[model samples]
Target: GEVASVPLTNYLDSQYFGKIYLGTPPQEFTVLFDTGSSDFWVPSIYCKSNACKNHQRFDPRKSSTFQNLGKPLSIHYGTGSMQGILGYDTVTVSNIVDIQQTVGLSTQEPGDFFTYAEFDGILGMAYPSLASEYSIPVFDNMMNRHLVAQDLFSVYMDRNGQESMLTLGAIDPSYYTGSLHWVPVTVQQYWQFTVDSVTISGVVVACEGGCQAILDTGTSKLVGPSSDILNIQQAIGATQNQYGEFDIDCDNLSYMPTVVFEINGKMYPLTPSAYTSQDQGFCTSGFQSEQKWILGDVFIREYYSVFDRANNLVGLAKAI
Candidate 1:
């Protein structure tokens, strides 16, 4: 694991499937990098976990630079809630996690169900908020300060029991072997991106299908709204049975649709196992309620997603 004594776990994986930090800190509690959600939340001074004893927590009471927003806040995930406060601070530091000139700011708190997260806090890397209006999204604030070194990043998750990584800083063109398809962004709200239409076997599943899909590495499953979900189900056809999930016979499947991104004209192709879960009872959740589309790692594994901040565009295709 000692490649050049760099300490294996200390860097982003070359294949685009591990976690990298804006800054990597050593603490009792673990901090996770989430690209699925946009708000940054770490354990607070009040954190009472077996893992919180010597870990770092934002104490507004101690840091002379800490500021208060005068507003209370909370963030809920698929099933957990992390609630705290909203405020501003000076956040001066040389290497907060490992990133130079980057400030470590805190907003929101009192984590619930963030069990075994092993983190001091969270760095929300998704687009800003139209979804999380309460707390200041960590990435949004970083963008405001022009601290993000690389504007683009990506994830690569394997099918079934396989795993992947979440890379920060920049996308390695090695994953996408040749020129990738890049798409134009028509939406402005953060935590939101759009795919022109969903197609199956070359047939377009139309009907004003512009939903805000957040491409996230933090989440394991791909999510879209119920209406959109049903549409996909109908187009993929009955090879997929069941209500929430479509059971595509692994061997019986062929020529699945390659999702296209309008911004860069990238086509993401899916094999049977890549798109359909082996979890026979897989229930299509997330997008069932009021929220936007979340294009998770399932779509990511097949292509190298390029987040270009030099010009602000998203391109997805075989790693080139």
Candidate 2:
């Protein structure tokens, strides 16, 4: 099978989007490539929601191949909720095109959830188990029908906000340097992995008894418990703002210590530049406070990731 290396654009360091055509004769829209959830959906023309006001939407009346499932799809994420209906149509990524793919056409949404969002919809890359009922995730059906070479895909991103790559059914060695380190997935729900610890300058700051980390492209930053993440911010001399963001001195980032994650007996270190971003005169962290640890785009931008569904494992390596 020919590999599809889809080009993705980084949107304000908050989201990664790729171009895809939907329905017959194809209408193009930039979609959010999410590894955290399993539903492929775009806003429908019928949506009167404020979130859809500024975005492109799908019109079933225009697509000859569109099929109405007429079933509601209510999906909730850490950010907000998407209320929509299920349907089927052709979806074309870079090269691996799949027909009769389940799609969600959102009719209602959290007013502010997608107020400033870039993509028109989300194309999830997780297993079917995590998908809403009747939504057979695109990738799952692709592999099932042998639309790809194998049950594997890779994500390569960077902090420069340039075009990245999402290669389907194959891993391109040219994107990353060194050997790939394979880690077994503890759970298939979210590409979850167990981390030995999170250390700063070689001292364990959290996860002394191991912790779960999810590699999520849909998320913009690294999210963890407030108690744990605040400690990391303070160690780096970051001041918490009223909006709950950490502000630091952008000019002297070189002096800051590195943050490391010990996974599968190997140490993956993040430099000050890798985990922190400079905006104007102030600096903001790619680290956020939440109930769980999510290794989002901040981490994925540094490490090229290969999600091997067949083997139930994930491969990580340094990117070019």
Candidate 3:
């Protein structure tokens, strides 16, 4: 009945993940609470892929309550893909527990992206429509079983070498300052909303008419159409390096322009410090080229994000 706070580890300011338990006695595994997709998966012992071998695998035979759904599972992500089977087990996050929750047990993971990942698996927090194999999401099961105080969850990311938090069921007001700005969800599938425009120094650069954007915690950078991203990168004086990544001067961050997103009549700005990441004495822009516009951890780290299922709204506030 209370908010379950799951402490998340910030992995190089790129990946933020937390621990969760599965089965009766509880098989612990670290997972990324992703908002872009809806499905829960962990490696299975049957998998022979190099990616699976390096991570913790789930042995269903060891669990007393594991039930095979006899259904195949396949998921394609932006960076990797997985082939698995569906099963039901007792899933636990923090103190919240849901019995007979559907989980994907990966039999194959064919990619190098996940092999180097900080987390063992992914726990999707999006709506059920995006779920693979018709599996109900863990958060949805919590709401369906009336195991939570509210049908919503909030995320707070700390990029200052501190532990972040994923608060389930209820919003934690302590992590944020000022009142939340509620924006209506344009699509029920993803945590999507309409963007009025994208501006740099009071000049509109992209999304002139309008555009759709999703708040995806799974992604590390701010992604948009290739053309739009190039425009923003150039406006900020970022040059593409040999590796094709936008590079910026770490010392000249103060001279970089602030990128602002006008959403639902509200202005959300991303400053130079918030849009550039420093690594090995080099600074790089967090803007990436993609087909869709995604405001990822780069945005969430600046604003506390709330996914409200009951009202189909997203609440945003400045993080403390």
Q: Best by TM-score, which number?
A: 3
Considering only N, C-alpha and C atoms within 3 Å, which residue pairs clash in candidate 3? Answer: none
Q: Please list the C-alpha lDDT of all candidates, in the order they appear.
A: 0.47, 0.88, 0.91
1-320, model 3: which lDDT tens digit per residue?
Answer: 64698999978988899999999889999999999989999999989999999999998889999999979988988579999999999988989888999999999998899899989999999889999865889999899888889989999999684869998888878989998999999988999999999999889998887899999999999999988988998999899899978899999988889999998999999999999999999999999987459999999999999999999999999987
Model 3 — which ten-residue stretch has the worst lDDT? Answer: 159-168
Give me the displacement of residue 239 in model 3, in angstroms.
0.5
lDDT of 2 at 147: 88
Query: Taking the tens digit of each residue's C-alpha lDDT, what string does model 1 give over 203-285?
Result: 66532455557666555456666666667655554333455435554444465444443432334555454555443434222
| Model 1 TM-score, all chains together | 0.63
Task: Write the residue-wise lDDT of candidate 2 on 182-273 in tens digits.
Answer: 99999888889999999997788877679999999999888898888888888877887789667777887889989999989988888889
- The backbone clash count of each candidate, in order, is 30, 0, 0
Q: What is the Cα-based lDDT of residue 161 in candidate 3?
A: 46
lDDT of 1 at 38: 61
